[model samples]
Target chain A: HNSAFDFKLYMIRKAESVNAALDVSVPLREPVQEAVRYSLLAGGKRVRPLLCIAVCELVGGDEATAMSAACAVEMIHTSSLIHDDLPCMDNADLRRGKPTNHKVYGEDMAVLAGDALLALAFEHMTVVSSGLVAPERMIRAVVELARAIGTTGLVAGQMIDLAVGLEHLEFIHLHKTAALLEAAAVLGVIMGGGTEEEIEKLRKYARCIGLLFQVVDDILDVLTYPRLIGLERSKEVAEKLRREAEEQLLGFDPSKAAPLVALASYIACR
Target chain B: CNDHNSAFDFKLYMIRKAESVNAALDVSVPLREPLTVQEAVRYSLLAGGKRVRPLLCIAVCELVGGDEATAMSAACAVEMIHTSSLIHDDLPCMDNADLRRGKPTNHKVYGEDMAVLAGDALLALAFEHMTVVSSGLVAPERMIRAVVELARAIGTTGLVAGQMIDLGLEHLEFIHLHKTAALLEAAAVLGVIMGGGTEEEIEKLRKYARCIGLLFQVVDDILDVTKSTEELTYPRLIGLERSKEVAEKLRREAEEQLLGFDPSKAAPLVALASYIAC
Candidate 1:
């Protein structure tokens, strides 16, 4: 079967490249450095970054084209996780099966560490992306990622989840869990120099997969979808989303988009 | 009184600029959805401080013949950085102050978690605001430089580095210079860059700012003795009079830089340095 490349092997290789960049992004030299590294290097599936590279490749961009946006997406994701583990935020002692950042490094260091990571994301993005793409394109990508973290996106989502309940459940999770995922996909399109129409298309693909990603998680844990919509219907919706996500890729060459299609199917089944 | 320089009343000029800044800062962060975080950002940024950073931003932009409108967002951005630092400084992990500008602190009103998140959000927003607003007004390189300048100021090269270094008996000056002077230097440099000043002009403003930054911190330390007796306080080690003398020296050095430009064009810079030293 000649289908783009080996999906699982491709993911493993790309993830390895991401880890290599991640380690050097922040050097371990100071007390604060240690604090930042503790969470950034802590294990989680680098799903968001892989989406960046996968979409970039799917859109005719090379690996370097997506590296900055990929690194930035993951950095923001990692920073969010660090803040999510703070004493006042989650009080969760276990993140990725290890002691939380605040648990090991005091609250002060943890807060600053998260802050450093966030700031570095912007710094790293502007500097690295400028070298790879035009100024306007890079700025567009920066604003895209920044908006996701501001009041309208991740922070807003987190605050809503905290101070209030699921008043607008989809709205909350869209911004909280799926906003970054959408950004990861959109960033790849931008890096790959996709058209406005193409950007919009990939965005739909990304956002749908984002919802599917969360649904699959919930389906496995505590029957997240089953409780809300019933188990049978939940699986049906998941299949629909997976199909639609892959359907969005139909406009492109099959070989080019095979990885993304494979990813949607993998998430749907896993 | 002359047209621009002699006729300029520093207090009145500040009142006018601060009013505009207050108006802008008031509406800069919206109060819509996720109202809690928005409230925290607004509570501190719009609480009515001296508005020195924004004023300097606007003033230098004007001094270089750029429209104040082009510089307004950057002005607000700098002030946001200042406001965010104060919020975090008042966090329980840090200085832990309960009152700021005679009002209950941000954490007091919104809790510690919201407080940190708000500060971090404000910091991120500052860059976003500058980038978005600078698009049509300034060139791309200028915008990138300005963003990087603001980021570096708050990062290890500026406030964070100064913050992490424990305030020590001998390192008191180091702390003040890095933490205080660093952002102030960035403020002056950013103002010039956004306003399209020449390299020579930016360097002059930068040197002028370093003097003023030192003067500001020394004066701050002297002023703190009546309220604080901590190791970080300057007057505790050298006494108020000695600190005042040091401030005087910085004041003179700052004024010297203005001689390169017309005094009338340089009036605001001169007035700002005098205002701090006084």
Candidate 2:
């Protein structure tokens, strides 16, 4: 149907808004800004921020509530990717099909480039998002994102990967991927003036679709699901998670949730 | 009886501030399993130096009628930024220096990845700590202002610009103002705001800080010459006698800014200005 294409159209426009806003947020320092710009504008699906905007709009909150936060999460996502690719970490030579930031700017400035953007995320969250709503809401949103980036969430996954056996694989995937996606969904609810029950619902939805993303990838490559759960069970798991995500959206007008429903289906079907 | 230079020992004050600040950093950065990274962060942070920034922050906060309790975490944040900057600056890709404060450089022991991750984490923690950790202790607006203060001082126009600019193309003082002085400026400004100073009072304290900040660089230059490590000199560049006059001039200007405060309350700041720049 035209629904999937329509959802991508919405995603493209939102990504443009986030990138334009990000371009505004970083200051004009030399190699630092240059390096930050490279990865920040580096083309990808732009997942986190779009999830943020989608959730924000799904609730009654205006996009203003999401703008600064949208940009902030995107910055945080880029920072994690930058650190994830560091020489000591994944040590990947390329990201978004370009030389890694450390390779281009040298490791020293690259480390700090990640830092400047990370700090800039908080700076924008509080300093720029001061328009309306409970200020505490914004504060709590910042805390949520902060915990995601810090030892509690992002590093937790990276650190937890050291564990062996069955539980370890999903634990790593959830912390590194699902936690951030959960934050992405929940922040819009928080900032959009949605309720506790609403946040709780959307988070479960985000986690399912988030987990599905990895399973879909695993099916494409022999690295994961094929070895442990095998294709039959993995596909079953992906379908179940996909269905659970759709069930959560039953509370929303299906027409309004068309983008997210379509988005999740696209992942499962792929 | 022109004993205007009250002669209080700033060295003793430095020790007290550094002690309290170090203890607070432990409280702020709780130890965790990535013990290598945690130890790396704490190692540079606790290693002793003048701790001039935190002390300036403390002095300004107290002078403006707030206690060290309100500004302590923020004071820790400034030092964290300073320590991490040094850690990154000493990296193999940066200045590639060997020794700092008599300890092996962070990269030297942990290697570049440790230094980089720890530095990245430390700097990230600084903002997160300032915004999230210090929230309950400060007025929301005041905390926001203070955060913006630190960000402005270290942002694009601040330290990075100064470092990346070629020394041959710029004057030494121009570089010194951004690299070192801006940090001092942020410490004093944030301390004043956290301490409940008025906007006007914060503005006055900012100029006081900037004066002594530039003054610190000149004195550091002269001290290197005096100790015969004389590679670069304010002494020869502007002449030894002329450099001392520059330091004294800045010291007087710094002390002059503190005159608006009660003499009793202003004593520590007056002494700090005199001690470093004189």
Candidate 3:
């Protein structure tokens, strides 16, 4: 059954749609314009946007319904990446094989670029999708996305991650990592016209997958999980998480959920 | 109109309206989990600035037939953004101020890391509060429109552009409009939308807002020069007397925009311009 999914091709196709949308989301003519475009267009896996689009399709919605919302989550993700690389935060030298935003544009412009993108994300959703989605649905998506990025979501996670010296790594990862992914998938369901039941199920699915994405990363890097619990246990943990994510999709028709199911397996193997 | 303005008890109105705005802002960020950023947000947010932006927003909304309760969330949102900008402006990389309103700046009290996160959180929360809290009060379409205006106000073409250009008389005016007037434009625009204002009303209040916004800066520049000030100001570039003329001209223009509305509805806005002028 999984053989028909073509997970790599599916990801590339969704990433292409996301890239195209993101390309024009911020124009490159003005002063800080280039700084915004530089990192936003620098290109990453765009997993969040893919998740958004996939969840919408699973819930019987079109790509157009979720396109702007999908792109918005990615925009927020890019902004967090830009800020995370700032001299004040992670202070990383490089990202996605290019100099970080601060390296190319200095800290001030980098910060402003991140700010602009965050604002643009909200603007893009309401402005771009005005006629496509119902205003109520758009507002719902905005609230979901905003809550995910604020104090109880990304900001909360980042703060403890900094002070945590590591909540205690679950609280940090849950907020910082899982929060946006959960929002991304949840926004998809909302825009896609999913029922409350579907939304809750996919929300749980995205959360499991969200934490799974991080756990696999730690295993691949021979980092946190392996160092703490041993490689074999970390592998077991990843498998269990992947299974939990898969269980959430059982209510959906398998044909429609193929992409998400494959996506979960891809995270496990990675 | 002047007689109406004189009779309006402007000071009392502003005090009551500001108290209302303060109350709304008080509950916008609760001291919940991730206590540090929440505290920082509430600290700067609840800090007793004049509540000018929120006041402008609520006044415009009421003028267009909406009530304070309907406009409260958006009003608080504009203030959140104002506070967020103040926090970021005080960071070491930006204006780097140690004190704002005679208190330690957010960065001064919370450390730069929390300050940055607090600003980021507030920025996100503005839209969150604006959308979530205003869910039923205004039509969703209007809510989205207000979100667009507020979001645009803070972006590259607006506040961020002003910050980037910190490196402006023609240039200076451009900076002041974007840095100062853009958010005010959004504030008035948000109010009008929330109140179901027509296009004519929206355009009218927008012009009124831009005038007062610039007037606010011109007056600030004059006070700085007299009380002594910008590191480019109206007084510095054009001299004190000419700058005063500019302020007076703007105040008159601002009041002129409100002339078509009900005089009672327009009274607070008229008084606001005069307050800035004085």
Candidate 4:
């Protein structure tokens, strides 16, 4: 139990490092940089990068190799947050207990900041992966990352989120949310240089965990207050959607998903 | 010089090619339904320009053992960035130009919301085009370099830096040379970089680009005052004599930079510099 606590703390530290790097990397013009940094460094759970690290470690890979990959994943996640908070999207006034990016930096700089962060994610991968791995691997990783963030990935998800407009969401939510989580998991394995068999195993593990994770997130939204969960509230309408997500993840083998299963259990208890 | 009756009419060729490129750009967005995004993207994209940047890209490619077709997508990508910048520039909060290329600005045609989306779409499509064009054509490293260079140029340190400085200078007396010159210089230098030029060649190209870029701006400011609104974009607002001085100084600087390149191959660059000054 003590060892597990230590490992969790270690993961938190590394994840914080990634968040720090992300804050530094997202260049905004002057006063706006302060706003961008404010939201970026405001101290969320860093769950996305942590998930990448955990999956990489579970697959018997070195943490150092996955560090940049993890950071890249987090940067992409942050980029999404920046865009999601814009006037065109959620238009939220606050995020993580502070003024949202667009709220603080205004809409235009927020847009550019999001773009710069996305571009910088690729830049980070290119620079960090240099001399550490084969160019082919790095290139493939970048292409994968871009494809996940581009139209077919995050942008498409955003479009659906906006266009759907409180209508019943189908595969769109899964594509928007789970696709990125799955990409994070797949990237971890790829960065760790996991064997093909191991990669497939991890891929399946990631798919199950991603769906499970989103279900738990939706559940938390339905059940918890902002004071308790440290995030905004969900409407009653979203509760049905949350249960639907939980119902969909019923068949995955709990034995095969030791860490992810534990994670879901923790969220469930909370 | 053989001058074989100018097999390719460069200007005519570029305009026709630009039309095709714009057609591809039109296809890139969802055109049939005409979403707000589609309109915004099409508005600025369809707004006509001289296509000089694309011509420069093609010309540089030809100089470095490549052809126009080999570099067509890259040319389009450059124009897309140019269009995106223009759309953003004309925002009410920015330069606030009401007309561009002799037509209603993008924001005027499509609301500011659509204008913003159009710029975003153009930027995304630029990267997509680079990805598709680079596949099995040029080396991946070259493509990556081009993408990275283009991103940096357009991002905070490149074009955005210029825009930031421009905005920050609303109450200030003079504009800095580096802010304006750096953007155009990056565009020119990127043309050579994209064409697979050597490091040393790229360095020389940078110097030439810097000179020409500043000269172009100086000439532009000068032309804005002397030429009719039909001939220029931002001249009357900035004044005439200062523009002339700026142009002359930039022309001389650009000429000096041309001396760094191989004299034999530098004539066209020199001529371009002189023509802009005149």
Candidate achieving the largest lDDT: 3
Docking quality level of the chain pair in candidate 3: medium
DockQ versus reference, model 1: 0.56
Listed models, DockQ each: 0.56, 0.36, 0.80, 0.22
Instruction: Fill in the DockQ of model 3.
Output: 0.80
**lDDT string, candidate 4, A1-270, tens digits:** 453455466557866776766665665445235644665666777776776776666666666777777777776677678767766556789886788877766666776666555555666666676536665555556656756664555555555445422222424555567666766777776777655565555555555555555545565653122333333333332344334433433444444334554444444344
Error of 2 at B117 (Å): 1.5
Q: What is the lDDT of candidate 3?
A: 0.87
Per-residue accuracy of model 1 over A200-269 as CA lDDT, tens digit each: 8788888788878777877887515667677787778788888889878978988888789888877877
- Model 4 iRMS (Å) reads 3.3
Superposed model 1: Cα runs more than 4 Å off: A1-5, A29-31, A164-167, A222-225, B1-8, B167-170, B226-231, B236-242
Ranking by lDDT: 3, 1, 2, 4
Candidate 2's displacement at residue A255, Å, is 3.1
Across B111-218, the per-residue lDDT of candidate 1 in tens digits comes to 888888888778778877777887678878777777767777776556766776642555877787767887787788888887899888788888888898888888
The 10-residue segment of model 4 chain A with minimum total lDDT is: A223-232
TM-scores for all predictions: 0.92, 0.88, 0.94, 0.75
Q: Would you list the C-alpha lDDT of every candidate in the order shown?
A: 0.79, 0.77, 0.87, 0.60
Tens-place lDDT digits, model 3, residues A1-270: 554359888999999988998887887666578888998888889999999999999999988878988888998998899889988888999986778998988887888888888888888887877768777878887889899999888988887778721225778788999999999999889989888888899999999998898889988885277776778987898898999999999878888999999999888886
- Chain B TM, every candidate: 0.91, 0.92, 0.95, 0.76
TM-score of chain A for candidate 2? 0.94
Error of 4 at B99 (Å): 5.7
